[PDB]
Structures are given as C-alpha cells and as structure tokens.
Homo-oligomer: A and B are copies of this chain.
Amino acid sequence: GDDRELAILATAENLLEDRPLADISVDDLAKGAGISRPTFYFYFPSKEAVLLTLLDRVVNQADMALQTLAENPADTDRENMWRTGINVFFETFGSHKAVTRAGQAARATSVEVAELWSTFMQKWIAYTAAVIDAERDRGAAPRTLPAHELATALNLMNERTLFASFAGEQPSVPEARVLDTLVHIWVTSIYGE
C-alpha cells in the first residue's frame, strides 16, 4: 500500500545518488522495491512520475517548514531572522541533493516539474516581498526597489547559488560558506539605502 509506494520512492532516491534518471529503469525501481514490473505500474505511471512525487514531497517539506517559522517568530535580530528563513532551503534541499539535482535536470523536459517549481517559487517570493513590505512599514527598511522585484532577484540568486554549491559546480560558493554569503547580500540589499 503506502509501504510498497514508499519503498519505490526510497529506491529511486537511493539510485539517483549514483546515476541520472535516464540510467535508471522501471525494472531497477521494481527490484529495489521488491515487486514486479507490472506491480510498479500500479503505483506510478512511469519513472518520471516517481521523480515528480519525490520533488513534490521535498518542496512541500521546505514549504511546511517555512510556514512553521513564519507562525513562530524566532527571537533574534534581523540578520538572524533572514538566515533562519534561508536555512530552511539550505537544510531541506541540502538533505536531498540527488532529488534536487534530478528535479533540476527535469525542469527542461517536464511541464509538471516546471509548474510545481514555478508555483512554489511564486509563493516564496510573495512571502519574501510581504516580509520586506512589513519591514518598510515599520520603518526598519528603506523604500528602495519595488519589494516584489527585489524578492524575485534574491530568491533566484538563492535558487542558482544553492544548487551550484550542492552540485559542487565550477564556479560555486563552497557549501560551508554559502549561507553566510547569501545572508550578507539579502541583509545589505534589503536594509541598505
């Protein structure tokens, strides 16, 4: 039931650590999950749908963790408030690098992967701009750029820079320095006049 399905998801996340989706077959997923090939098709329509579900779970997990933070103001300065919010994405996607990397490569070929990522990016950007606007209304941040365009560039910087660090791309910020690097650019660009 849920257990056959979880096994197929866990097998897929395991195999994605060692190779691309294109080198994984339904048979591989089935075997690792302990079921036949036609039994697999009962739970998912294809290997692509397995990645879609893995991505959907990671993205919802980041999203629920951000909602938790939002409902629960951490008792600290502005710099540390931004750091804890960015750290949701650093720790959540950072704990699922193979899925992130496969989900990235799938954006170009899968409309459902592209729209899932786009829906949540819009949600996180709107939340970011709502926080910047709140900061400006309270007199803590100056009215510089439109809050929504600034939120957009900052979230896209994080998407690209986090990914680069997790993949070890050249060039990339080392993964042990990427949080401090991003928090500095967010705080100076939000609070700086």
Q: Does A1 contact B (CB under 8 A)?
A: no
CA–CA, A172 to B151, complex, Å?
Answer: 10
A125 at the B interface (CB under 8 A): yes
Quick one: closest B residue to A118, CB to CB?
B170
Contact A184 B180 (CB under 8 A): no
Instruction: Flag the segment in A8-16, A33-41, A47-55, A159-167 that touches B.
Output: A159-167
Say which residue of B156, B169, B177, B184 sits within 8 Å of A157 (CB atoms). Answer: B156
Chain B contacts for A192, CB-based, 8 A: 188-189, 191-192
Copy number of this protein in the oligomer? 2
The answer to whether A153 and B181 touch across the interface, beta carbons within 8 angstroms, is yes
**A108 interface residue per 8 A CB criterion:** yes
Indicate if A79 sits at the interface (CB-CB under 8 A).
Answer: no
Chain B residues, Cβ within 8 Å of A185: 150, 153-154, 157, 185, 189
Q: What's the minimum C-beta distance from A50 to chain B, rounded to whole angstroms?
A: 20
Q: Which residues of B are found within 8 Å of A178, using beta-carbon distances? A: 153
In this complex, how many residues of chain A approach chain B with their Cβ under 8 Å: the count is 38
What residues on B are CB-neighbors of A144 within 8 Å?
Answer: 184, 188
Q: Is A182 touching B153 in the complex (CB atoms < 8 A)?
A: yes
Interface-central residue, A172, A180, A192, by most chain B CB under 10 Å? A192
Chain B residues whose CB sits within 8 angstroms of the CB of A181 once the complex forms: 145, 149-150, 152-153
Return the chain B residue nearest A150 by Cβ. Answer: B181
User: Does A105 touch B at the CB level, under 8 Å?
Assistant: yes
A25 at the interface (CB under 8 A from B): no
Distance (whole angstroms) from the CB of A170 to the closest CB of chain B:
5
Q: Is A173 an interface residue (CB 8 A)?
A: yes
From residue A20, how far is it (CB to closest CB) to chain B in Å? 10
Q: Which 3 A-B pairs have the closest CB atoms?
A: A157-B157, A188-B192, A160-B160
